[PDB]
Amino acid sequence: RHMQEILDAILSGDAASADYAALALPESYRAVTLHKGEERMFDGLASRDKDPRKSLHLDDVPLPELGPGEALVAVMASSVNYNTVWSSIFEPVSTFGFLERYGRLSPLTARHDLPYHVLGSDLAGVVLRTGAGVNAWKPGDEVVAHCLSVELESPDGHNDTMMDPEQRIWGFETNFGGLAQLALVKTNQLLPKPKHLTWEEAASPGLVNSTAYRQLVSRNGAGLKQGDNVLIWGASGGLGSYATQYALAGGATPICVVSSPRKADICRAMGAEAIIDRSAEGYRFWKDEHHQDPREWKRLGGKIREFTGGEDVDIVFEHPGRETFGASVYVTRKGGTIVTCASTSGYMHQYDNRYLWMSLKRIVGSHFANYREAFEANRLVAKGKIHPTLSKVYALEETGQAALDVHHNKHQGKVGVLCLAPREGLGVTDPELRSKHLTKINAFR
Amino acid sequence: RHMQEILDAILSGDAASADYAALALPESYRAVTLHKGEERMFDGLASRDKDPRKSLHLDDVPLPELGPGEALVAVMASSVNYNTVWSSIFEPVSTFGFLERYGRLSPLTARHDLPYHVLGSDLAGVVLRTGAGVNAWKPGDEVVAHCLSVELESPDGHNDTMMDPEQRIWGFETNFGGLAQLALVKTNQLLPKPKHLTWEEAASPGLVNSTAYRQLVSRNGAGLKQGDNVLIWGASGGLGSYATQYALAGGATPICVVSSPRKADICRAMGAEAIIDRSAEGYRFWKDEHHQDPREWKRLGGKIREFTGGEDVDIVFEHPGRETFGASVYVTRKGGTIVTCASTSGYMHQYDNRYLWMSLKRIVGSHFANYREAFEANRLVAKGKIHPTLSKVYALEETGQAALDVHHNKHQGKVGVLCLAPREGLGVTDPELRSKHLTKINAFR
Amino acid sequence: RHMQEILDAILSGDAASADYAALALPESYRAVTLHKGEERMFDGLASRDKDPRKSLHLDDVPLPELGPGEALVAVMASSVNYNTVWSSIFEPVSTFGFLERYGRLSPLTARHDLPYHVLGSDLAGVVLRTGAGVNAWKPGDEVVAHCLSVELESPDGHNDTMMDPEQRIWGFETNFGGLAQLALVKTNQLLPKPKHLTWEEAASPGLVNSTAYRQLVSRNGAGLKQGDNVLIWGASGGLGSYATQYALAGGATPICVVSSPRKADICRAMGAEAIIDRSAEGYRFWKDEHHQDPREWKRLGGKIREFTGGEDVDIVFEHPGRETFGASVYVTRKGGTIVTCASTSGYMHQYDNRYLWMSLKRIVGSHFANYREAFEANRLVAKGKIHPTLSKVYALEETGQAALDVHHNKHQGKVGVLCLAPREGLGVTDPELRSKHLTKINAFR
Amino acid sequence: RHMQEILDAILSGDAASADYAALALPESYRAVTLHKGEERMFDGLASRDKDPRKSLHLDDVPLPELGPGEALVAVMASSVNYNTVWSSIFEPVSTFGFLERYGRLSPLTARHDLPYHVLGSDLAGVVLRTGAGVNAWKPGDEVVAHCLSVELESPDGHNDTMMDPEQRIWGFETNFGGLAQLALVKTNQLLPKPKHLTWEEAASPGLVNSTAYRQLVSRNGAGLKQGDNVLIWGASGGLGSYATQYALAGGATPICVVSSPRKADICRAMGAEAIIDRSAEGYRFWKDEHHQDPREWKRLGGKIREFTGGEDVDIVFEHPGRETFGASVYVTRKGGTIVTCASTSGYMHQYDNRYLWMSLKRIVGSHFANYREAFEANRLVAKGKIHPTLSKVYALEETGQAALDVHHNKHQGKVGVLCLAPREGLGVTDPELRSKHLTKINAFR
Numbered sequence A, B, C, D: 001r002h003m004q005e006i007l008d009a010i011l012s013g014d015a016a017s018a019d020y021a022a023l024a025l026p027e028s029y030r031a032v033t034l035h036k037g038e039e040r041m042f043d044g045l046a047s048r049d050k051d052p053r054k055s056l057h058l059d060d061v062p063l064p065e066l067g068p069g070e071a072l073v074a075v076m077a078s079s080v081n082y083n084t085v086w087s088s089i090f091e092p093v094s095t096f097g098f099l100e101r102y103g104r105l106s107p108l109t110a111r112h113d114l115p116y117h118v119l120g121s122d123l124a125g126v127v128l129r130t131g132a133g134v135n136a137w138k139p140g141d142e143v144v145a146h147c148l149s150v151e152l153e154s155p156d157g158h159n160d161t162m163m164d165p166e167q168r169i170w171g172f173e174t175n176f177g178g179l180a181q182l183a184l185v186k187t188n189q190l191l192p193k194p195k196h197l198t199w200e201e202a203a204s205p206g207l208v209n210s211t212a213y214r215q216l217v218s219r220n221g222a223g224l225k226q227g228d229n230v231l232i233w234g235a236s237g238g239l240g241s242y243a244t245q246y247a248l249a250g251g252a253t254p255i256c257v258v259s260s261p262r263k264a265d266i267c268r269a270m271g272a273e274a275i276i277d278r279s280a281e282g283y284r285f286w287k288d289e290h291h292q293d294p295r296e297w298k299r300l301g302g303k304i305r306e307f308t309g310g311e312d313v314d315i316v317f318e319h320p321g322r323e324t325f326g327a328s329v330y331v332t333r334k335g336g337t338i339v340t341c342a343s344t345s346g347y348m349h350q351y352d353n354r355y356l357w358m359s360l361k362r363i364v365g366s367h368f369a370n371y372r373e374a375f376e377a378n379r380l381v382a383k384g385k386i387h388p389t390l391s392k393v394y395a396l397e398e399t400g401q402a403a404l405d406v407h408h409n410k411h412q413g414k415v416g417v418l419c420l421a422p423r424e425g426l427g428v429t430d431p432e433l434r435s436k437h438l439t440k441i442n443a444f445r
């Protein structure tokens, strides 16, 4: 069987590029899919009551046709992201609608409109084949992927590709995602695998790490500098588990927000010291459905100042959205920045503009990362400066359960998924660098 | 009488600096004031039902003691600003609340905590006296004032003085404003009077012109460049009457929003062609008290694209606030900027964050201007590149009516006020430059 | 004959996309070429004694194979650039070296490694065919080109493509340039043709205009704002002319430097008023081959201040290099910027660093433009805000003489070349916009 | 004796603000001075043969009159800076030329135009008296002083005070410097003393730490971010000993250049790993005295790449000037920044502009720091994130020897000077924080 021979060559460690080019491609591959017919199955239920285990299937699907500028990748491991969860509960809309509408553009785009949607927006693995015009990547190259799919035909993205008007999120607005044994990506999504990490660890930072890097570190986001005070909501989640690391590695002070003493201890394990538990404080920023309580804004602001010696934060790392956003704007220092990439609790934000203009603050929208920012974020991982935050790993066959844990907030850092990898622990080729950092690497386990 | 002697010297033309130094200072001056006792006379009434004529008094007040780094200015003219309106209807709080609590600091700021409040945040006039440490300005100098009052003892303002924690607005959070025959200002508020303008014209740009300059032109605001498309709310109001000029003079395209065809004609007189009447289009961005209508946002966005050839705006010049802010965020181009210095219609903003993060937009809060920005804005006026926008002039005794007109929105550009100047038309000393630009200078009359 | 039928289709004005798709591609096309065998013919000669008429041949060459993301363009007109002239004298090295070495990379790059090299880095024309993966452009589209050729496989260019490490300049480091009846370009080189211009006018701004735009207008260069004073060396040259237009269109003040009273008249024709004749002033910035004369820097600075009312320039637009650079650093305002894209007089620059650090100045290097900047620069042409500067037009068969003209600086404006266009004056489809700007369009004739 | 009673009050540790206010001011104070007579004395000699011990005098000088916004400070300790060395060798120009022509401005600045010059640009001590208009600082306050003297009457400095046209360096371009028992400073030079440091340690970072902070960390300089590679010339000198710390604490990689293995060991003690010894490597960047050797530039570049895994530096921290500047421009990464605040080896820089424009690099001039940058730099010291780098301390009477050591390169630290402090080791009031950082605090000893 051809898939087993691909895995055997990977595990062998001796296969050269010519060997991979010679290996026969399988005729099908195992993939975690949504089914088009079942897209209304959660109709009328509440969001908590929607169960990804009901809609996620394990299918054998044919290999898509390789186009120019693309690579076929044998996937050793992937991860669950929030966008995967939303996809699995057909929220906010069935991902199938875009796939069909986009597919009518050209024959190449049409490959993605199918009765099934292969999900997954992270990958770690090995290049099998490359389409026409590809020089920078060869069969056998060990890779991770970022999830930005840009065509770059418009000039708009040529000073920062996040401005491309035709940007899709791989595995979400494209098919052939990474929760599968094989994946199709553009070669400009490919990055060198950090050699000191396992397959599942290498696959875990991708989406959240690059997002946090752009949002906090890069000049396209908050432009952090050493000495800054930074409020980090959700500091032990996927995004926060990288944002906290960037604040500390950058010489800044994180004020970490968590919802349980258990999460607080992980932040201390990361090296943070100023930690706020939103439950124990019992913040109620909203009096009712339509009115906020500035007394509760001010109470958050006083709690921050206890940790900073009377200083207000230079940057708020936002993502919870409507519930917290009025407080985020209020507590930010004169001249400071609220940077936002999400609105988990609701996207209709309300805030008092007097604080924004009279104190010269700014709200900066950020989304994923361009290839240079993705490369820089992955490079900091490769250098041992930023660490994966895996808490639990599931086999591909159990992806539905992994999605539900994330949906219900059962875990802390990243939830990983094995794909072709037969067990955890494989893929390390820099044991010296790994052993220097193993304690941090395992801090979320 | 010593006030007449001061005016006669100014009107004369050959008074040297020594002559002004030798003039006797009056023991009192006429000023437009609020009265501490009356500070709640409008409590219980509705916003449109407070008439500033009820709360604005013409009193004779003693001269304050001159301090270090300050100047006593004989005021030839001033203007009404919206903050003057807000002051006169003791809304949102009595300006006395500030004055009172501050004066407890230093005996110098204590001079401002009085039972009356001399209003006014613009001036054009002549320096009479300077306090200790004043080298750049001398008696007899023709000046306009910007309204930034900064102490600059804190380090915070030394990379942009707007960030000074003690940054106040002169005549609003300080006493001895410009709607009076004399005023007290810091000498770092002083700028050279544009020689081609009359006293009342020279006093009209100060507050709104410098604010629009920082908001739209400077790198501390939207950083406009030629080719940009800029949506300008209230394009024929105080702020808009300068923002439109900066867009056109900078090589950009303003899309001007007004509420009457009469105001549309002024915008065409300024050189603009893309004009939207919000009354005629009947935008109703809010369905009910708590929900907006995204179909109305899209309708604005389509109308803009009719003027731009399918392009979305790079910058939104905001200030109306809650009524328009959701639409402003929606219509902005991917990567664009919404810049806001106010919220006339309500400061509790609501917007859909999905548009802000998924299209990488930013909301930038802006407030007045630092001295360098104020100087640059006044310099463009002095060079004839930006023109005053006076529509109507009142005598000092009629300031109450001037404020009512702005309160109810009877006027268009700036409403000016004569102080010591006995009639309009005085104070020009560069007649050739004035003749070059008079048609534009008079565009709002 | 197939080439004639392509031209007939273009001149007809009613050919639809499907019509172009069905046209027969010729077997050969006529092209201006260098010959590998002759690359040593000028060895031993001074630069000004090398004659491009001796090295430039008119050949019939076969059509290259169309690759992914590429377009075959029927070229109506092109222009002579400085890089074309240098290539024609095999300076600084022969262009064949790069074509050979680069051709070793892959079969696609090998297409360019030929015994002949078709030169030309500007184009205006009509798309004939597009390779695999192209949806933005289609047969029949009227285009101009920018000359940046980037693969974008490296992440480096994904936040500003000028940072791409393996960039080529089309027609200089690639084959199939624009001085020919057909050309091969990447589709990410294509821009919409300005409809109000003729073929030869539309082909003229490209390289020099986008370069000046990035250098002066964009935030990657000097970030011009209205009110700035800008010193522009060679203000009537190819580059200095577009810089002068950008200064004026953005509301800044150019201080134009020229070498003759007739060149001063060109600057006045462009709308500039502050003009300095370095020949009349007799500046000798260098006392000998190794020592500069600071008293001559000072003389330039005083003369500048005569035009600005005592103000030093915010920006120096540099390109002459060693001769002028010390003076450019000297005269720049405290906090100002010297932006440089060339060193025509010599690339070993000498300056007094005391002025740079003690007055907090910066020198910013700039080079060509990314696709977004090229689009914005061409869009300002399409809007009628920036105008082509054609001074003389040659037919394709006379390209050798056009190159000599540029080599000996016989013209102040761009030198254009007709390719397929049978005469000047064709290709206008927005005659109303043309009429409005006709006098400016012809200012360099 | 009044001076002795001031020192006793400080050493007692229980003197209140009112006790300092009641202390009798001395009528003279001991100071390190230059003499305007001794003006010319080193002319005709070479730089190394200039002995500061001949030109630096220990005189008794009368107290200057205190002005508005100023403070008289009892100086416990100071430091030697390079500007002290340049002052003492009257080189390039005499500092008297500054002092002298200035004071003819205002009677307040005229106090500084004296026949002697009290040197010193750092201080740690205790406020004794404040002038009119001072609220933020009071007698008894423990302070360090930054050396920025700005008048701020001009608007130019109000968006970054370094742009004030009257910006000066206290103790170098002004009188009453800190190498003395008393000093006169503007209160906007005052910063809170770090409580965990001794007087001499607290005085040592001021000038070079704030300069390195602006140059490397702030957005007004290089804008460092974690992951950047930074080449740091003179990494164990004054400036470099802070620049190296900022690189490491901000998550970047310094490539440190020193001239002895002993200095290399200190860099390793600071936490750096990539270290280049310029003497051992034998770089000779200048062929003759008018020509450089690009083979030597390339050799440095390959040495850097050995440390970075083949990456070129994002930032070069320059200050040696002519000898190294050509290399610095060459080795910088494409799109990178060379930031320079000095030219120790000669201010006539020469560099190859081809590397700057073709690789889109920039040279950014930087000079000291504004009050906000100085506050942020001192705050990082106060938080124990940046440490002082004292190597040796001299008594006030031996300042000439201290100057000579820096002039010839005998030491590596900052070299500190006791003023009123009778011995080393006094002034710590936060011993717990000191203990946490003592090993790093003493790394240069």
Ligand SMILES: NC(=O)C1=CN([C@@H]2O[C@@H](COP(=O)(O)OP(=O)(O)OC[C@H]3O[C@@H](n4cnc5c(N)ncnc54)[C@H](OP(=O)(O)O)[C@@H]3O)[C@H](O)[C@@H]2O)C=CC1
Pocket (backbone or CB within 6 Å): A081, A082, A083, A207, A208, A211, A233, A234, A235, A236, A237, A238, A239, A240, A257, A258, A259, A260, A263, A278, A319, A320, A323, A324, A341, A342, A343, A344, A345, A366, A367, A368, A369, A409, A412, A413, B357
């Ligand atoms: N490129 C983009 O634009 C990206 C967006 N995303 C995100 O997708 C989702 C994933 O974020 P991710 O970190 O991976 O998911 P996680 O669940 O792993 O972490 C999110 C954290 O947010 C906190 N949180 C949730 N709700 C609230 C609330 N109402 N108030 C305060 N805190 C709250 C929780 O931390 P705790 O309970 O401990 O307080 C939670 O753990 C987000 O919605 C965002 O859209 C992610 C990557 C990229």
Ligand SMILES: NC(=O)C1=CN([C@@H]2O[C@@H](COP(=O)(O)OP(=O)(O)OC[C@H]3O[C@@H](n4cnc5c(N)ncnc54)[C@H](OP(=O)(O)O)[C@@H]3O)[C@H](O)[C@@H]2O)C=CC1
Pocket (backbone or CB within 6 Å): A357, B081, B082, B083, B207, B208, B211, B233, B234, B235, B236, B237, B238, B239, B240, B257, B258, B259, B260, B263, B278, B319, B320, B323, B324, B341, B342, B343, B344, B345, B366, B367, B368, B369, B406, B412, B413
């Ligand atoms: N932070 C700062 O430094 C400064 C703030 N301010 C301003 O005070 C307030 C007044 O500004 P100013 O220009 O002098 O006042 P004006 O009244 O002169 O102009 C404001 C314009 O806004 C328009 N407008 C008013 N209400 C609405 C609405 N509900 N929706 C849409 N448009 C509306 C009106 O134009 P039309 O009806 O024709 O559409 C009006 O002309 C500004 O909003 C801001 O607070 C001013 C200067 C500085």
Ligand SMILES: NC(=O)C1=CN([C@@H]2O[C@@H](COP(=O)(O)OP(=O)(O)OC[C@H]3O[C@@H](n4cnc5c(N)ncnc54)[C@H](OP(=O)(O)O)[C@@H]3O)[C@H](O)[C@@H]2O)C=CC1
Pocket (backbone or CB within 6 Å): C082, C083, C207, C208, C211, C233, C234, C235, C236, C237, C238, C239, C240, C257, C258, C259, C260, C263, C278, C319, C320, C323, C324, C341, C342, C343, C344, C345, C366, C367, C368, C369, C409, C412, D357
């Ligand atoms: N980096 C890039 O992307 C680009 C660079 N270029 C440059 O093109 C060439 C120069 O630009 P371009 O304007 O098109 O060429 P032009 O010949 O059309 O103009 C050059 C101008 O330089 C002036 N000049 C030359 N030498 C001196 C001197 N010693 N002192 C003062 N002025 C001098 C002359 O002014 P005189 O007329 O005073 O009156 C001349 O007009 C270079 O080769 C360079 O490559 C061009 C396009 C792009």
Ligand SMILES: NC(=O)C1=CN([C@@H]2O[C@@H](COP(=O)(O)OP(=O)(O)OC[C@H]3O[C@@H](n4cnc5c(N)ncnc54)[C@H](OP(=O)(O)O)[C@@H]3O)[C@H](O)[C@@H]2O)C=CC1
Pocket (backbone or CB within 6 Å): C357, D081, D082, D083, D207, D208, D211, D233, D234, D235, D236, D237, D238, D239, D240, D257, D258, D259, D260, D263, D278, D319, D320, D323, D324, D341, D342, D343, D344, D345, D366, D367, D368, D369, D406, D409, D412, D413
């Ligand atoms: N603009 C501003 O505000 C400031 C400027 N300065 C600068 O001070 C001087 C440097 O400051 P500072 O750090 O206090 O002085 P230091 O003497 O303490 O350190 C300077 C370092 O530069 C190295 N160096 C000296 N000469 C050369 C050379 N020819 N080539 C390469 N490296 C060299 C030396 O290290 P090694 O021998 O180990 O290689 C030396 O340690 C500058 O001249 C200027 O005065 C300083 C502070 C502020």
